[PDB]
Amino acid sequence: MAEPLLVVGLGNPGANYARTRHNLGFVVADLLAARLGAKFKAHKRSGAEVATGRSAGRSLVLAKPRCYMNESGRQIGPLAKFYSVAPANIIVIHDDLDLEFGRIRLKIGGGEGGHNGLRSVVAALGTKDFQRVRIGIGRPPGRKDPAAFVLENFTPAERAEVPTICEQAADATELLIEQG
Known part of the structure; x- marks a missing residue:
């Protein structure tokens, strides 16, 4: 309602990573920004880029870190303080090794499913009770290291x-923003 919502798409910066499994959050965040007709801009008091808008009448703040995946939460934490958003009202979109390719799920809390990006957010917010929009990418073939898989x-x-x-x-x- 009155409370602002911070929707964060996770991923790695650079053109080489724009289309990798570990960047789906960035892509989804870009569809959302376009759908709203909002553009991203530097946020210096955090280091990430933000775009603002509305959805379901709710005040919306969309963002994407400008640092690499592991330091991700380091920019989200102060982004939440700037806009004073509670962790519970923070939604983060990510690729998920534990869900089959294309299977989308929702959840507030739980584990990180080996996603290093989720672990820095938890580490930063001091809690795992922030919303997540999980996008299945399936498990890695045995011929490929899990970390390498997500970056291909x-x-x-x-x-x-x-x-x-x-x-x-x-x-x-x-x-999810409508009633999750």
């Missing part, structure tokens, strides 16, 4: 669905 692009067949999957994730976030 999607397979040819997966790449074809990624767009529709992110649209569904953006929709999931909007409904």
Whole structure:
């Protein structure tokens, strides 16, 4: 209601990572910004980039860290203070190794499922009770290190669905903001 909402898409900066599994949060955040017609801009008191808007009548703050994945929470924490958002009202979109490719789920709390980016947020907010919009990417093949897997692009067949999957994730976030 009155309380602001901080929606954070996780990912790594740089063009080499723009289309990697570990960056779905960035993509989904970009669909959301476009859908609202809001543009991102530097936030110096945090180091991340922000875009503002409305959804379900709710005041919205969309963001993407400008640091690398592991230092992610380091920018989100002070971004929440600047806009005075409670952790519970923080929604973070991320790729999830524990969900099958394209399977989208919602949850406030729980583990990080090996996602290093989620671990820095928890580490930063001092709690795991912030909202998450999980986007399944499936598990890594045995021929590939989990950390390497998330930093590689999607397979040819997966790449074809990624767009529709992110649209569904953006929709999931909007409904989540609507009454989650």
